[PDB]
Design a protein around this ligand. Structure first.
Ligand SMILES: [Zn+2]
Lengths: 51, 89, 135, 131, 154
RNA sequence: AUACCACACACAAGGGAUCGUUUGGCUCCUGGGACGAGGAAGGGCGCAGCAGAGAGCGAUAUGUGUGGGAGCAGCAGCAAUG
RNA sequence: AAAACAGUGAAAUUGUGUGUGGACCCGAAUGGAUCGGGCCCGUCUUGAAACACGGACCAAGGAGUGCACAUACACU
RNA sequence: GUACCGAGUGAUCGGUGGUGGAGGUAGAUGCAGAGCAGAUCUUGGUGGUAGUAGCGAUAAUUUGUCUUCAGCGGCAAAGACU
């Protein structure tokens, strides 16, 4: 909801910046072997436990 | 009834993020953390050997301890501007 | 290839027409795909083949073994020996009356030519003569 | 036979040491032999190949060819030589890389620090040769 | 490249194939079965009648508990069906071969459907929720398709 | 049995056994046995030209000195004034 | 928890073509109708085809071992 | 690995033709984590049943028109409902 503590807000801000795919240029690099970022999440499928 | 309909009432939250260990296990009413016993001075007894090795020295970064070993190897040389203080001592 | 051992030439056809074509398939290998055809003796308490009821198949045993003279003889009337070198044929020089040579599968073309040339001059029969070297 | 027990003879250990090399140890991998004449012009028997030097290819598809070194790939250990290439379905041409040890040096590129590099190695020899 | 499932000359034949199509396997092979050995213009005419409910596809292998119908009498059976989604796809596929025939320099006539086959493609997974807290499968079954038509010697 | 069901063989599907390979594991031996009020071990948050995770590093987030010496893996730019 | 090579690519199972049969095995044959014999395996049990139990199908894994102490045999 | 053909009472062994693309045996001895149909066995993959059972408690929907490229999607006009 609208009321939040400072500690809860920083957790949300960090959880929101980490939630991104692999940038499209990295895929062209000779040494790079990852397909998809397995740390990506959806609000419909997991809980953060920020509480 | 004790199944599905009772699940609807479960909207309160007894644990929050502990400031010593990070583990979302500080019980607000009891005033105690269930992972690390904060605010007691010592850390909690861990239940078994498997579980305690997950939090030992060397599981994180060891920043200070690594530098100390390199300095000991070198013979504790110190900052080269101040050699005269070292040599006197 | 149409060749015969000269000592048995007038007898070889009687011998060949006399060999059994019986097979001893494992019991119920016809019923489930997980049981292979290879013989194993049945050991069940109730089993109809072990108990030798009429109408069940026959089991292997010593009675079916061939006469000592006929045994191991190829249909051309010789016994076989495996070879992989020129220096192997040298062993057959006393035995060529009854034995013939079969070059091992892994020996390659360039080497096979050298084996066959030696076989011609020593007078030894090689049964894989055509082999891979037809081209 | 080896009598020093501090040096390893394990296949697993020797292989890891090769592929995970860095710094000066990586440079040692790019060495090639000099031709007979250059081994009289200079003391050295072998040097690390650099752009602009002139090389004869002594093994492979491009045997007998001569040309100038265009590029040095350190991560995938290969050298690109001018005029050694393959053509795609498109008609576009791609330079094919050759492993250092299949080359031989015919003329040295003497740009930059090369003359000092050579001097440093010659002195290191004599220092112990004359003793 | 693609290895077609039988051997017919490149001259005097026309071909097409597709992979992982999202028409339903069992419906598609009942369609293909009935138009085998038929002349191409006849095939296209027949499939137009199926879309209008004027004629039907008869069923023989994937046919349990199916409805009976007076249109099935044309093929000596009682059981038939109208699988619109598969028919629209096959019709488009056949029409394109007449373009290829014309452009290649054969006639638009005397072409006969000599070979046609359907294969199963890998399943696409799905789920439905059941009672008592269970979850059950709800998958999709796509297909692969080949056709070859040849000119009659006559 | 025109078309269903079964089996055999050839071709196309479907799955990942087998054989060939290994910058990993395990065991024995030898060395080592070096943390913290000068703020440790462990947790969090920031820092890249395009940068999510991981690695490295602290608002000096690739600084100084010594010994060397050729490129920086993609694209754009840098480099014997390193 | 899973996930090695952009190698090789078995079996279960599916489609098409060509042949042979109506559950299949053993013995003996025809140009051709077929003749004779056979109940479903494993297991406890006086006694199993059982209205006794386990088994839908295929691959891979899967159960008398190591040490100590007396012992009889064979060998030095 | 796959079809055929030969040898052995049998456990098994040998050859020939396609596929595959780098390693492999024969004799005598040594050490064992050394042979599967079953355990409501363990893990992974696939059938028959079957184009079948079902997918439709609640207020309700029709016509034209544009997109969509084939969404009872959007907009107008009616008909209803909380
Ligand atoms: Zn805590």
């Amino acid at each position: 909801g609208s009321i939040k503590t400072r500690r809860i807000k920083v957790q949300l801000v960090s959880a929101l910046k980490k939630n991104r795919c692999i940038p499209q240029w990295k895929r062209a690099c000779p040494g790079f072997k990852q397909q998809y970022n397995f740390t990506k999440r959806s609000w419909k499928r997991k809980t953060l436990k920020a509480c | 009834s004790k199944g599905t309909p009772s699940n609807g009432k479960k909207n309160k939250r007894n644990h929050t993020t502990c400031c010593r260990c990070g583990s979302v296990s500080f019980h607000k009413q009891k005033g105690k953390c269930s992972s690390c016993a904060y605010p007691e001075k010592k850390m909690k007894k861990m239940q078994n050997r498997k579980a305690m090795l997950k939090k030992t020295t060397g599981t994180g970064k060891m920043r200070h301890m690594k530098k100390e070993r390199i300095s000991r190897r070198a013979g504790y040389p110190g900052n080269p501007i101040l050699k005269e203080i070292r040599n006197k001592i | 290839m149409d060749i015969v051992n000269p000592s048995l030439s007038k007898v070889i056809d009687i011998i060949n027409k006399g060999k059994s074509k019986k097979q001893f398939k494992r019991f119920q290998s016809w019923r489930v795909k997980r049981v292979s055809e290879s013989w194993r003796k049945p050991r069940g308490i109730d089993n109809r083949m072990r108990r030798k009821f009429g109408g069940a198949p026959d089991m292997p045993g010593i009675g079916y073994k061939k006469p000592n003279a006929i045994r191991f003889l190829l249909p051309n009337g010789y016994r076989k020996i495996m070879v992989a070198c020129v220096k192997d044929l040298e062993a057959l020089i006393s035995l060529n009356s009854f034995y013939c040579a079969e070059i091992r599968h892994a020996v390659g073309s360039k080497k096979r030519i050298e084996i066959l040339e030696r076989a011609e001059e020593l007078g030894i029969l090689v049964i894989n003569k055509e082999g891979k070297l037809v081209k | 036979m080896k009598f020093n027990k501090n040096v390893t003879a394990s296949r697993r250990k020797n292989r890891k040491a090769h592929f995970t090399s860095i710094g000066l140890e990586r440079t040692k991998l790019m060495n090639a032999p000099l031709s007979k004449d250059l081994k009289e012009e200079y003391g050295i028997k072998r040097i690390a190949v650099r752009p602009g030097d002139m090389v004869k290819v002594v093994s492979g598809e491009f045997k007998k060819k001569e040309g100038v070194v265009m590029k040095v790939n350190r991560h995938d250990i290969k050298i690109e030589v001018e005029g050694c290439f393959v053509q795609k379905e498109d008609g576009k041409k791609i330079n094919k890389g050759i492993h250092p040890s299949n080359l031989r040096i015919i003329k040295l590129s003497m740009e930059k620090d090369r003359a000092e590099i050579i001097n440093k190695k010659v002195e290191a020899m004599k220092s112990e040769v004359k003793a | 490249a693609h290895k077609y499932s039988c051997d017919i000359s490149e001259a005097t034949s026309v071909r097409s194939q597709y992979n992982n199509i999202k028409i339903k396997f069992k419906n598609t092979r009942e369609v293909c079965n009935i138009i085998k050995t038929m002349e191409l213009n006849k095939a296209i005419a027949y499939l137009n009648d199926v879309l209008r409910f004027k004629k039907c596809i008869p069923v023989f292998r994937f046919a349990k508990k199916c409805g009976r119908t007076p249109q099935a009498k044309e093929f000596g059976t009682d059981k038939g069906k109208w699988p619109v989604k598969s028919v629209a796809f096959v019709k488009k596929m056949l029409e394109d071969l007449l373009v290829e025939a014309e452009k290649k320099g054969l006639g638009t006539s005397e072409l006969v459907i000599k070979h046609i086959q359907v294969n199963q493609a890998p399943k696409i997974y799905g789920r439905k929720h059941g009672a008592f807290g269970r979850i059950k499968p709800y998958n999709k079954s796509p297909s692969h398709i080949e056709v070859i038509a040849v000119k009659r010697e006559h």
